[PDB]
Motif scaffolding. Structure first.
Motif, PDB file in Angstrom:
ATOM      1  N   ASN A 238       1.442  -6.105  12.689  1.00 56.26           N
ATOM      2  CA  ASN A 238       1.322  -6.481  11.283  1.00 56.26           C
ATOM      3  C   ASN A 238       2.601  -7.157  10.802  1.00 56.26           C
ATOM      4  O   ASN A 238       3.191  -6.796   9.788  1.00 56.26           O
ATOM      5  CB  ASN A 238       1.001  -5.249  10.440  1.00 56.26           C
ATOM      6  CG  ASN A 238      -0.489  -5.002  10.315  1.00 56.26           C
ATOM      7  OD1 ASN A 238      -1.282  -5.939  10.222  1.00 56.26           O
ATOM      8  ND2 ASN A 238      -0.877  -3.730  10.296  1.00 56.26           N
ATOM      9  N   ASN A 241       1.682 -10.043   7.830  1.00 54.67           N
ATOM     10  CA  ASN A 241       1.522  -9.511   6.483  1.00 54.67           C
ATOM     11  C   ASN A 241       2.875  -9.233   5.834  1.00 54.67           C
ATOM     12  O   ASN A 241       3.098  -9.577   4.671  1.00 54.67           O
ATOM     13  CB  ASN A 241       0.672  -8.243   6.523  1.00 54.67           C
ATOM     14  CG  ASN A 241      -0.811  -8.537   6.631  1.00 54.67           C
ATOM     15  OD1 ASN A 241      -1.216  -9.549   7.207  1.00 54.67           O
ATOM     16  ND2 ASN A 241      -1.637  -7.654   6.078  1.00 54.67           N
ATOM     17  N   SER A 527     -12.826   1.084   2.938  1.00 56.26           N
ATOM     18  CA  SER A 527     -12.272   0.887   1.602  1.00 56.26           C
ATOM     19  C   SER A 527     -12.401   2.186   0.826  1.00 56.26           C
ATOM     20  O   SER A 527     -13.206   3.058   1.166  1.00 56.26           O
ATOM     21  CB  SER A 527     -12.975  -0.255   0.865  1.00 56.26           C
ATOM     22  OG  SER A 527     -12.586  -0.303  -0.496  1.00 56.26           O
ATOM     23  N   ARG A 587      -6.685   0.445   5.504  1.00 55.04           N
ATOM     24  CA  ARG A 587      -5.563  -0.230   4.857  1.00 55.04           C
ATOM     25  C   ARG A 587      -4.622   0.735   4.155  1.00 55.04           C
ATOM     26  O   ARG A 587      -3.548   0.313   3.716  1.00 55.04           O
ATOM     27  CB  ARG A 587      -6.076  -1.255   3.846  1.00 55.04           C
ATOM     28  CG  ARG A 587      -6.226  -2.664   4.405  1.00 55.04           C
ATOM     29  CD  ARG A 587      -7.544  -2.840   5.136  1.00 55.04           C
ATOM     30  NE  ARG A 587      -7.538  -4.025   5.988  1.00 55.04           N
ATOM     31  CZ  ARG A 587      -8.627  -4.558   6.540  1.00 55.04           C
ATOM     32  NH1 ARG A 587      -9.815  -4.021   6.322  1.00 55.04           N
ATOM     33  NH2 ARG A 587      -8.519  -5.637   7.304  1.00 55.04           N
ATOM     34  N   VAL A 612     -11.652  -6.628   4.890  1.00 55.36           N
ATOM     35  CA  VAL A 612     -11.226  -6.740   3.497  1.00 55.36           C
ATOM     36  C   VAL A 612     -12.345  -7.375   2.683  1.00 55.36           C
ATOM     37  O   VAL A 612     -13.168  -8.132   3.203  1.00 55.36           O
ATOM     38  CB  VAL A 612      -9.917  -7.548   3.386  1.00 55.36           C
ATOM     39  CG1 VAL A 612      -9.364  -7.474   1.968  1.00 55.36           C
ATOM     40  CG2 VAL A 612      -8.885  -7.042   4.386  1.00 55.36           C
ATOM     41  N   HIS A 645      -6.436  -4.407  12.833  1.00 56.31           N
ATOM     42  CA  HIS A 645      -6.314  -3.244  11.964  1.00 56.31           C
ATOM     43  C   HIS A 645      -6.944  -2.011  12.597  1.00 56.31           C
ATOM     44  O   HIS A 645      -6.373  -0.913  12.549  1.00 56.31           O
ATOM     45  CB  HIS A 645      -6.962  -3.550  10.612  1.00 56.31           C
ATOM     46  CG  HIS A 645      -6.290  -2.886   9.453  1.00 56.31           C
ATOM     47  ND1 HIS A 645      -5.151  -3.391   8.869  1.00 56.31           N
ATOM     48  CD2 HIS A 645      -6.602  -1.763   8.766  1.00 56.31           C
ATOM     49  CE1 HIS A 645      -4.783  -2.604   7.870  1.00 56.31           C
ATOM     50  NE2 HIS A 645      -5.650  -1.611   7.787  1.00 56.31           N
TER      51      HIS A 645
END
Ligand code: SF4
Ligand SMILES: [Zn+2]
Ligand SMILES: [Zn+2]
Lengths: 714, 171
Positions: A238, A241, A527, A587, A612, A645
């Protein structure tokens, strides 16, 4: 354990190394010999650090001129502490082997908030507050007043450090952050500034990315001194990001109002300064005519002249104008608007703010604010953020974009709009690292396939190898479940999210898996909203109560305090025989921060492919720009972002010490060839077609059998 | 629109923000419902100050800060002067020294008497207009035209990219 590596002979503290370690060492030596930046992946969370450090030390001994020093970066300070422990063990082993001390120094840098010895700043934990308080205590004005020795609290540690450490540097040794705090207390010096100076003569330096990527603070400590140094980023999959975050600046209505209030205070302070002391502080004008840190990298940064803003009043008016323009541009109510160059052109046309004078806005802010002898920078921090944005936009917009959101997500009508300046490509901000340093090694675990990384980050890799963990026992037995007891597709699609049958399949699978799996289990959703909906459905049905009976259940929330308390109780539940089922979000910061080891997160459950939301406009710029430049398909990058992820959040159970554990992905999407191909090699090779699409019951049975096999000793 | 209200009729500024400030030689936060009230009596006189106006001295502007309104209008007028490009001067300091004088002029006009500024501006009118001021008017017009042309070229390229990928898919 001395290994006769092909390049040279390399010491190693532990008794034995797996063949994957041999492959890792030889590939790393090849990259160093080529003296070219490259990327490689190694499964194990631990062991890679020791192998990498040993190889780097041996290479330094063989060719000290080739590599000046090692810059080993880790995600978080709690993680880098384990790295410094490993380095200390390696140094002790090598020192015992040699029989005497050698001129080798290794240290870790961390924020003044994390480590400091001043009682006034000790109680405060907020980083901006620590920075401002330290700036006030160490201010050139405070230093000059300390020379006068007037009655005023002066921070003696920095003065004593200037007196002594300047003359004498630390001979050698390894100092953790906690031990360095004790050393600073004993010697009456700064654990921070002492390490900062040792960076000039240190063989090994370790700090997180935000100490090496953001141009504001990275450059000062990563100056050209390390012209040819081995810079290594660990578990930095990552990295894009974080590199984007180092550039993106968010402007909000509340922040703008705070900026306006701070600007009013600035004007009042300027008037008071004019009436009290004017000539001495006006000398700043002369030095300016001659000609918080700038966000412009080495080559992009310019220092020709401040521009048309040469006095306090002129600069204040310039900031007033730009703040008014931003305020109105944000107040406009309309669909999301993107305008990288058009924003600058419209600013210049509407409010008569030329880009060249706007370029030096942040630097002149730093200088002028220093002149004001302010109490601290914490109060004016929003203004400095706005100035950094103002200078960045005038600096460049070729690979950037200004997005305006009059309306925030999750709210039909909210009076707090937000203006984003999210980047689109990390190559722009990571270019200085690659160019300045002769070679960079992005060593990562759970890495989604390397081919994409050169496309995202503009660099020419030397070696592209995937290392597969090899052990006498099959430590990991991953599986994917796509078919439920009803033989129904269980994909967690957006249109299929509402499916009560799919939610029931997930609940039943979790119930059986908790019934069979030993204490400690973690389930990752896609999520917060989806997790809440699934939890509510299970609560309405009787599945959730049965899960509660079988094992304790804990859930994650956005609030960090509740997250920490829940995880603290989860650890105790794992220690005890109650067990625990920790529901979290992929996340979620908890997923990345936490590391799961033996008897912790034994069975990692992944509920749905992590994707996402397809409405966040920031990702639209980030994604369509990647399609336009570097030629990456939108679906390709989206699936890559999901697989990377998932690998990040599922690769924790194999941390180290060969602790058994199974990774179950309750989604038929993972069974697709593309997802399997993009999955890391070490997991995929263990994965087989026989268990690729097991039904819920079959997966439960095979998990029970695999746990039986792993229970017995070697 | 964020202003609390007009010094006299702070009503509209609460009901709706549609009203926009009206610039004047006085430099004021004037509002249209109040502009009618000025037109009815006086016809170009500031209510409290009483500053005379030739023809209502009214022009629309959009910022809640009256100081920003006056500063922006004064800067708009000033930009007509000292518009010579930077490259015209090889000296490093002279690049931004004249800009410093320009912004000093702007601040001087905002609050202090503008008589000295007007006399100075007459001096710069005579000496510079002979050659350089009209030349830089021409050059700034050329750069405005070419920036509008370049933005239309960018948007033609984006429309061609959209439509060509659509024709790829359908073909
Ligand atoms: S000068 Fe050193 S001891 Fe004093 S506040 Fe700063 S870091 Fe802490
Ligand atoms: Zn009114
Ligand atoms: Zn008036």
């Amino acid at each position: 354990m001395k290994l006769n590596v092909d390049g040279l002979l390399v010491y190693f503290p532990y008794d034995y190394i797996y063949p994957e370690q041999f492959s890792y060492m030889r590939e790393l030596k090849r990259t160093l010999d080529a003296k070219g930046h490259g990327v490689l992946e190694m499964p194990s969370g631990t062991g890679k650090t020791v192998s990498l450090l040993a190889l780097i030390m041996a290479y330094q001994r063989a060719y000290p001129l080739e590599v000046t020093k090692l810059i080993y970066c880790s995600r978080t300070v709690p993680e880098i502490e384990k790295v410094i422990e490993e380095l200390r063990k390696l140094l002790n082993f090598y020192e015992k082997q040699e029989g005497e001390k050698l001129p080798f120094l290794g240290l870790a840098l961390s924020s003044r908030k994390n480590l400091c010895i001043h009682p006034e700043v000790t109680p405060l934990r907020f980083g901006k507050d620590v920075d401002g308080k330290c700036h006030s205590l160490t201010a050139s004005y405070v230093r000059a007043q300390y020379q006068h020795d007037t009655s005023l609290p002066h921070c003696r540690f920095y003065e004593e450090f200037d007196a002594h450490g300047r003359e004498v540097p630390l001979p050698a040794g390894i100092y953790n952050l906690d031990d360095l705090k004790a050393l600073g207390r004993r010697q009456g010096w700064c654990p921070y500034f002492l390490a900062r100076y040792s960076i000039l003569h240190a063989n090994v330096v370790v700090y997180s990315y935000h100490y090496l990527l953001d141009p504001k603070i990275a450059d000062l400590v990563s100056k050209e001194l390390a012209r040819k140094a081995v810079v290594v980023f660990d578990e930095a999959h990552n990295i894009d990001n974080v590199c984007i975050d180092s550039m993106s600046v968010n402007l909000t209505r509340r922040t703008l109002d705070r900026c306006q209030g701070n600007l009013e205070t600035l004007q009042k302070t300027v008037l008071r300064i004019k009436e009290t002391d004017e000539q001495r502080l006006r000398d700043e004008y002369r030095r300016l005519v001659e000609g918080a840190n700038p966000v412009l990298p080495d080559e992009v940064l310019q220092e020709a002249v401040p521009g048309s803003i040469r006095t306090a009043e002129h600069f204040l008016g310039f900031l007033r104008r730009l703040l008014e323009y931003v305020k109105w541009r944000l107040r406009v109510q309309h669909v999301v608007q993107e305008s990288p160059p058009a924003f600058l052109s419209g600013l210049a046309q509407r409010v008569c703010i030329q880009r060249k004078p706007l370029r030096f806005c942040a630097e002149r802010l730093r200088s002028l604010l220093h002149t004001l002898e302010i109490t601290d920078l914490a109060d004016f921090s929003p203004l400095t953020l706005l100035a950094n944005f103002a200078t960045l936009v005038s600096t460049y917009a070729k690979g950037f974009t200004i997005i305006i959101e009059p309306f925030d997500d999750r709210t039909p009508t909210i009076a707090n709009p937000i203006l984003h300046f999210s980047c689109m490509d990390a190559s722009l901000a990571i270019k200085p690292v690659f160019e300045r340093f002769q070679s960079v090694i992005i060593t990562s675990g759970t890495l989604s396939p390397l081919d994409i990384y050169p496309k995202i980050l503009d660099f020419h890799p030397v070696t592209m190898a995937t290392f597969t963990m090899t052990l006498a026992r099959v430590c990991l037995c991953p599986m994917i479940i796509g078919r439920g007891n009803d033989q129904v597709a269980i994909s967690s699609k957006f249109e299929t999210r509402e499916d009560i049958a799919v939610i029931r399949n997930y609940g039943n699978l979790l119930l059986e898996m908790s019934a069979v799996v030993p204490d400690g289990i973690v389930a990752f959703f896609t999520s917060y909203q989806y997790m809440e909906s699934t939890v509510a459905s299970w609560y309405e049905q009787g599945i959730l109560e049965n899960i509660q009976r079988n094992k304790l259940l804990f859930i994650e929330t956005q609030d960090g305090a509740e997250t920490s308390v829940a995880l603290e109780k989860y650890q105790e539940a794992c220690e005890n025989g109650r067990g625990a089922i920790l529901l979290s979000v992929a996340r979620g910061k908890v997923s990345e921060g936490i590391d799961f080891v033996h008897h912790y997160g034994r069975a990692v459950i992944m509920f749905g492919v992590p994707y996402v939301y397809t409405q966040s406009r920031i990702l639209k710029a980030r994604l369509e720009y990647l399609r336009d430049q570097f030629q990456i398909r939108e679906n390709d990058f989206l699936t890559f972002d999901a697989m990377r992820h998932a690998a990040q959040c599922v690769g924790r159970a194999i941390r180290g010490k060969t602790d058994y554990g199974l990774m179950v992905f309750a989604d038929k999407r993972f069974a697709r060839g593309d997802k399997r191909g993009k999955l890391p090699r070490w997991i995929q090779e263990h994965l087989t077609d026989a268990n690729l699409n097991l039904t819920v019951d079959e997966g439960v049975q095979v998990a029970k059998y695999f746990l039986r096999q792993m229970a017995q000793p070697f | 629109m964020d202003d609390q209200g007009c010094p006299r009729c702070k009503t509209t500024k609460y009901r709706n923000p549609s009203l926009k400030l009206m610039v004047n030689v006085c430099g004021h936060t004037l509002c249209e419902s109040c502009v009618d009230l000025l037109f009815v009596r006086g016809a170009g006189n500031c209510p409290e100050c009483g500053t005379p106006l030739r023809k209502s001295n009214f022009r629309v502007q959009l910022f809640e800060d009256p100081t920003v309104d006056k500063e922006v209008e004064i800067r708009k007028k000033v930009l007509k002067i000292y518009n010579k490009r930077e490259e015209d001067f090889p000296s490093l300091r002279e690049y931004n020294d004249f800009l410093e004088e320009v912004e000093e002029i702007v601040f001087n006009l905002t609050n202090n008497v503008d008589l000295d500024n007007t006399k100075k501006k007459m001096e710069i009118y005579q000496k510079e207009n002979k050659d350089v001021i009209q030349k830089n008017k021409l050059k700034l017009t050329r750069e405005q035209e070419e920036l509008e042309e370049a933005l239309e070229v960018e948007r033609q390229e984006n429309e061609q990219r959209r439509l060509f990928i659509q024709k790829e898919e359908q073909l």
